[PDB]
């Protein structure tokens, strides 16, 4: 669960740049999609 919480906190901090087209936030969101799909596949 902590491996998911680290990525969630990183994405929440990248939202605070107030730039929704920032590539760093796009890549963090694409990483969280795969993390959540792997967690649902395991459970």
């Amino acid at each position: 669960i902590g491996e998911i919480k680290t990525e969630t906190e990183t994405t929440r901090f990248y939202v605070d740049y107030d730039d929704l087209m920032l590539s760093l936030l796009k890549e963090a969101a694409k990483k969280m999609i795969n993390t959540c799909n792997e967690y649902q596949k395991r459970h």
């Binding site: 680290t6 906190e9 990183t10 901090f13 990248y14 605070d16 740049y17 107030d18 730039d19 760093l24």
Partner: protein, 54 residues
């Protein structure tokens, strides 16, 4: 795990000065470092109370 990526983003984005993201970068820095000081201090106090129980 969070701090080592936010600080790398700080080194990446401010190789030259970026005046548009300058007001938010300081808030991100203050927020993550004040979070870390509190977490590290509570971890030390927890380990000390565990050591005093023997």
């Amino acid at each position: 795990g969070v701090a080592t990526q936010l600080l790398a983003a700080y080194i990446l984005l401010f190789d030259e000065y970026n005046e548009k993201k300058a007001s938010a970068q300081k808030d991100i820095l203050i927020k993550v470092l004040d979070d870390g000081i509190t977490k590290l201090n509570e971890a030390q106090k927890s380990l000390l109370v565990s050591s005093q129980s023997f």
